[PDB]
């Protein structure tokens, strides 16, 4: 579960870099799309942190 937490947190950093790229390219609609992927990864990361705390 700690490996899944590292996978989903590094995937969130990747999407944040895609959002940064979209903002320098002026494509704010793609920046919001990337932020939506980032949010589901950070919300599941908090669930895995909770699971890891129990474990």
């Amino acid at each position: 579960t700690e490996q899944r937490l590292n996978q989903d947190t590094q995937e969130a950093k990747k999407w944040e870099d895609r959002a940064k790229l979209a903002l320098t390219n002026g494509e704010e609609n793609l920046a919001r799309e990337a932020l939506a992927r980032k949010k589901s990864l950070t919300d599941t990361a908090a669930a895995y942190q909770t699971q890891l705390a129990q474990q």
Partner: peptide, 9 residues
């Protein structure tokens, strides 16, 4: 079009 940013860089 979402992936296209890679072609710009």
């Amino acid at each position: 079009i979402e992936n296209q940013f890679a072609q710009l860089e």
